[PDB]
């Protein structure tokens, strides 16, 4: 209800897509991080879950989609999950993005599309990118548009839903998808 | 009475842990006096040896020696447990101290609070209050920012980490006070209260406010 | 062991809520026992004491002296002198203090609960901030409407000195966590700060929904 | 002085005790008389003219109490409001004109004001008039805050109370006497 401004700030801040990142995982306050320099900035990539064991021996040289959580007194940009294979080239593919606004008793819906730079993308990159669109082209997290639910379609094989109530769970920013295995995306804004 | 000895083992400085490289553990005494050679023994004797200090003496006498165990920072966060035992020519019976990184914690509930409805209707200096509450151990860090700028320690006041009045789980709270220019507050910019704690996922947290 | 003299202003609690606001001069570090000349100056009830307290907090006790009645002379601002004469050495000990000048009142502020707590709708937190007063010494109490809540039910930090390139001023904060209902219900809460620089020695700020 | 606190205050119950007596202690450095009346102890602060006028405490006077607050010891502190004894030698109803000014228009409302005694306390005089200005002219409510009570004495001279903030304690000791009051005018400049 209130963290409306917060959610906005975040899901609209500048993202970052890096490559060939190498870094020995270190320990930090009991967590598994990988620090690294890129474009005048110093990052601190936290690994939580599906990605913590996958990279037990740090980052060989995969790809990282960084999103700034905050910047500690030491200049490090704390980021979470968002790494992808490495043998990741490019698959500029467009997925169908259906956005259904439910305001009032109405459903003033619309048809859009969604671009994808990588071949292997991270739920982190999807969630961010998506919401940003939902924010820019549908005024999400503004006025009273806060709750809703993004639903992804795993080519008639499953269904991955990301609640829009709050930020994606760090736990999740380590999962990956195959740009191709996507069929269509359906957003459902819930302006109360 | 007089100088009754007390051995105490101390945790590494949260600060060092979060922002430093070499975090240590301090094991010191209190009543004990005399003997400048009477050393203690630590458990993880991974080469790195303790480092006793300048006897130092409390008022009323009663000396007090300390022993800092270097870089024992990885093990700390790694859940290992330390043990410090001191032997003196005071009692043929030694004192044992044991400590390890807390389990059963609690993330700080950080709240950034807007200036007093009045403090602003004087266009001088508005007062920004930060309140971190209900958290695991009492070791916390509080910092202030003007957008992307960290203002200096000298530029603000944070009070001690006290214990919250409670009937159940034991939590603490700390408060900070940043006095800013009504002019700046008014022109629309923002401010942040970044907090440090070992229970917070990313070690830190930022809560931001503005009109 | 080591004997030292000390003077202590009358506690604010006493200065604002007690009758016999008395002052205390105390000598510690004596190995002796007693027979100590506790002579002041303002003779208006002068009546020291001793009752030798081994509680010198050290391996060698001491005794003290009180000057009851001096509840008002203090507010005026006279320079009290407590000369102490003890065995061990000749030249007695003498420390003396008076009221503090250069004072400012507290700028009390009763802040509402964080939007987020009203959301979790469990226990909202009322913050009290007193600031800019001089004599570090200050009192803080709470009220639910018209009833003073016990100290056991809230947290009050220590009066600290704030940052400024001049007028030395202090600030105090306090937290009172209250039932979500009661806040939304409607009844008010109040912060009551006490101080020497205040007019009626107490201000009371009240806030509600 | 923010609406809610003024409505709060200028609304509270006011007491008019009679034949009161006291010594005066140097509470926190100010002269104050203490006295119990209706199961409630008070602590009258003498901070204005009354400070010297009553340099010998209270011995028979009447007192207008208005709760500034209640000491954490259970003592209601009030400021000034002391009028000589054997003072109920008259009533008096004086003309009270109230003018609520808004969009630049008027809204005069000739009313009336009553005076309980012969000699008055600017405190009482002010406290009541505002109480009467709220209860019937919505003052310190919604947005009616600024104004200016004006008291007009025979001859010509006139005293003014700004509505912006509570009357200054400095002047709660002040005393007027019914007979020298021609009329009272208000101006609820609701800006
Ligand atoms: C052990 O840790 C303590 C705590 O960080 C260190 O003490 C600090 O030293 C710096 C100067 O280097 C001071 O500015 C701080 O005020 C000190 N804090 C304390 C403890 O009061 C200490 O230097 C460390 N020693 C070792 C052996 O690493
Ligand atoms: C203020 O000082 C007075 C006197 O030093 C203290 O009151 C004494 O209380 C004892 C209690 O048994 C009585 O026997 C004495 O007669 C009292 N002294 C006199 C002459 O009044 C009082 O306790 C002090 N106030 C505090 C608690 O700070
Ligand atoms: Ca107002």
Short mmCIF file of N, CA and C in Angstrom, two decimals, chain A residues 95-102 107-114 126-135 137-141 145-153 160-165 184-191:
data_model
loop_
_atom_site.label_atom_id
_atom_site.label_comp_id
_atom_site.label_asym_id
_atom_site.label_seq_id
_atom_site.Cartn_x
_atom_site.Cartn_y
_atom_site.Cartn_z
N UNK A 95 8.58 -12.05 -27.26
CA UNK A 95 7.55 -12.85 -26.62
C UNK A 95 6.31 -11.99 -26.55
N UNK A 96 5.15 -12.63 -26.53
CA UNK A 96 3.89 -11.91 -26.45
C UNK A 96 3.61 -11.51 -25.02
N UNK A 97 3.41 -10.21 -24.82
CA UNK A 97 3.12 -9.66 -23.51
C UNK A 97 1.71 -9.10 -23.43
N UNK A 98 0.81 -9.86 -22.81
CA UNK A 98 -0.56 -9.40 -22.64
C UNK A 98 -0.68 -8.72 -21.28
N UNK A 99 -1.13 -7.47 -21.28
CA UNK A 99 -1.28 -6.74 -20.03
C UNK A 99 -2.76 -6.45 -19.81
N UNK A 100 -3.34 -7.01 -18.75
CA UNK A 100 -4.75 -6.80 -18.45
C UNK A 100 -5.00 -5.89 -17.25
N UNK A 101 -5.42 -4.65 -17.50
CA UNK A 101 -5.71 -3.74 -16.40
C UNK A 101 -7.11 -4.10 -15.89
N UNK A 102 -7.28 -4.24 -14.58
CA UNK A 102 -8.59 -4.59 -14.04
C UNK A 102 -9.35 -3.50 -13.32
N UNK A 107 -12.01 -4.03 -17.56
CA UNK A 107 -10.80 -4.76 -17.93
C UNK A 107 -10.27 -4.14 -19.21
N UNK A 108 -9.81 -2.89 -19.12
CA UNK A 108 -9.28 -2.19 -20.28
C UNK A 108 -7.90 -2.78 -20.66
N UNK A 109 -7.92 -3.98 -21.25
CA UNK A 109 -6.71 -4.70 -21.66
C UNK A 109 -6.04 -4.25 -22.96
N UNK A 110 -4.80 -4.72 -23.15
CA UNK A 110 -3.99 -4.40 -24.33
C UNK A 110 -2.93 -5.46 -24.67
N UNK A 111 -2.54 -5.48 -25.94
CA UNK A 111 -1.55 -6.41 -26.50
C UNK A 111 -0.18 -5.77 -26.75
N UNK A 112 0.87 -6.37 -26.18
CA UNK A 112 2.22 -5.86 -26.38
C UNK A 112 3.20 -7.00 -26.60
N UNK A 113 4.47 -6.64 -26.69
CA UNK A 113 5.54 -7.59 -26.92
C UNK A 113 6.68 -7.44 -25.91
N UNK A 114 7.59 -8.41 -25.90
CA UNK A 114 8.72 -8.38 -24.98
C UNK A 114 10.01 -8.90 -25.63
N UNK A 126 14.08 -11.17 -16.35
CA UNK A 126 12.71 -11.14 -16.82
C UNK A 126 11.90 -10.23 -15.90
N UNK A 127 11.80 -10.62 -14.63
CA UNK A 127 11.06 -9.83 -13.65
C UNK A 127 11.43 -8.34 -13.75
N UNK A 128 12.70 -7.99 -13.64
CA UNK A 128 13.04 -6.58 -13.73
C UNK A 128 12.47 -6.02 -15.02
N UNK A 129 13.09 -6.36 -16.14
CA UNK A 129 12.64 -5.87 -17.45
C UNK A 129 11.14 -5.76 -17.58
N UNK A 130 10.44 -6.85 -17.31
CA UNK A 130 8.99 -6.84 -17.42
C UNK A 130 8.35 -5.71 -16.63
N UNK A 131 8.51 -5.73 -15.31
CA UNK A 131 7.93 -4.71 -14.45
C UNK A 131 8.29 -3.32 -14.95
N UNK A 132 9.53 -3.14 -15.38
CA UNK A 132 9.90 -1.83 -15.86
C UNK A 132 8.88 -1.46 -16.93
N UNK A 133 8.65 -2.36 -17.89
CA UNK A 133 7.68 -2.05 -18.94
C UNK A 133 6.35 -1.77 -18.27
N UNK A 134 5.89 -2.69 -17.43
CA UNK A 134 4.63 -2.52 -16.72
C UNK A 134 4.58 -1.19 -15.98
N UNK A 135 5.75 -0.61 -15.73
CA UNK A 135 5.86 0.65 -15.01
C UNK A 135 5.81 1.84 -15.94
N UNK A 137 4.99 1.77 -19.49
CA UNK A 137 3.85 1.73 -20.39
C UNK A 137 2.50 1.40 -19.76
N UNK A 138 2.42 1.33 -18.44
CA UNK A 138 1.15 1.02 -17.80
C UNK A 138 1.08 1.64 -16.43
N UNK A 139 2.00 2.56 -16.17
CA UNK A 139 2.04 3.25 -14.89
C UNK A 139 1.95 2.38 -13.65
N UNK A 140 2.66 1.25 -13.66
CA UNK A 140 2.63 0.38 -12.50
C UNK A 140 3.26 1.16 -11.37
N UNK A 141 3.12 0.65 -10.16
CA UNK A 141 3.67 1.30 -8.99
C UNK A 141 3.62 2.82 -9.10
N UNK A 145 -1.67 1.65 -8.52
CA UNK A 145 -1.43 0.40 -9.23
C UNK A 145 -0.22 -0.29 -8.62
N UNK A 146 -0.46 -1.14 -7.63
CA UNK A 146 0.63 -1.85 -6.98
C UNK A 146 0.52 -3.37 -7.08
N UNK A 147 -0.67 -3.92 -6.82
CA UNK A 147 -0.86 -5.36 -6.84
C UNK A 147 -1.27 -5.91 -8.18
N UNK A 148 -0.85 -7.14 -8.44
CA UNK A 148 -1.15 -7.79 -9.70
C UNK A 148 -0.37 -9.09 -9.75
N UNK A 149 -0.15 -9.64 -10.93
CA UNK A 149 0.57 -10.90 -11.04
C UNK A 149 1.03 -11.21 -12.46
N UNK A 150 2.34 -11.30 -12.66
CA UNK A 150 2.89 -11.62 -13.98
C UNK A 150 2.91 -13.13 -14.11
N UNK A 151 2.38 -13.64 -15.22
CA UNK A 151 2.34 -15.08 -15.45
C UNK A 151 3.11 -15.43 -16.70
N UNK A 152 4.12 -16.28 -16.56
CA UNK A 152 4.93 -16.70 -17.70
C UNK A 152 4.47 -18.07 -18.20
N UNK A 153 4.62 -18.30 -19.50
CA UNK A 153 4.21 -19.57 -20.11
C UNK A 153 5.35 -20.40 -20.70
N UNK A 160 5.10 -20.36 -14.78
CA UNK A 160 5.84 -19.64 -13.74
C UNK A 160 5.27 -18.25 -13.45
N UNK A 161 4.69 -18.08 -12.27
CA UNK A 161 4.08 -16.81 -11.89
C UNK A 161 4.90 -16.00 -10.87
N UNK A 162 5.02 -14.70 -11.13
CA UNK A 162 5.76 -13.78 -10.28
C UNK A 162 4.81 -12.77 -9.69
N UNK A 163 4.46 -12.89 -8.42
CA UNK A 163 3.55 -11.90 -7.85
C UNK A 163 4.16 -10.50 -7.95
N UNK A 164 3.32 -9.50 -8.17
CA UNK A 164 3.80 -8.13 -8.29
C UNK A 164 3.64 -7.41 -6.97
N UNK A 165 3.11 -8.12 -5.98
CA UNK A 165 2.89 -7.52 -4.67
C UNK A 165 4.13 -6.86 -4.11
N UNK A 184 4.14 -17.20 -24.18
CA UNK A 184 3.54 -15.89 -24.04
C UNK A 184 3.59 -15.46 -22.59
N UNK A 185 3.53 -14.16 -22.37
CA UNK A 185 3.55 -13.59 -21.03
C UNK A 185 2.25 -12.83 -20.83
N UNK A 186 1.61 -13.02 -19.68
CA UNK A 186 0.37 -12.31 -19.38
C UNK A 186 0.46 -11.61 -18.04
N UNK A 187 0.31 -10.29 -18.06
CA UNK A 187 0.34 -9.50 -16.84
C UNK A 187 -1.10 -9.21 -16.45
N UNK A 188 -1.34 -9.03 -15.16
CA UNK A 188 -2.68 -8.75 -14.69
C UNK A 188 -2.64 -7.69 -13.60
N UNK A 189 -2.66 -6.42 -14.01
CA UNK A 189 -2.64 -5.32 -13.05
C UNK A 189 -3.92 -5.33 -12.23
N UNK A 190 -3.81 -4.96 -10.96
CA UNK A 190 -4.96 -4.99 -10.07
C UNK A 190 -5.11 -3.66 -9.34
N UNK A 191 -5.46 -2.62 -10.09
CA UNK A 191 -5.63 -1.28 -9.53
C UNK A 191 -6.85 -1.21 -8.60
#
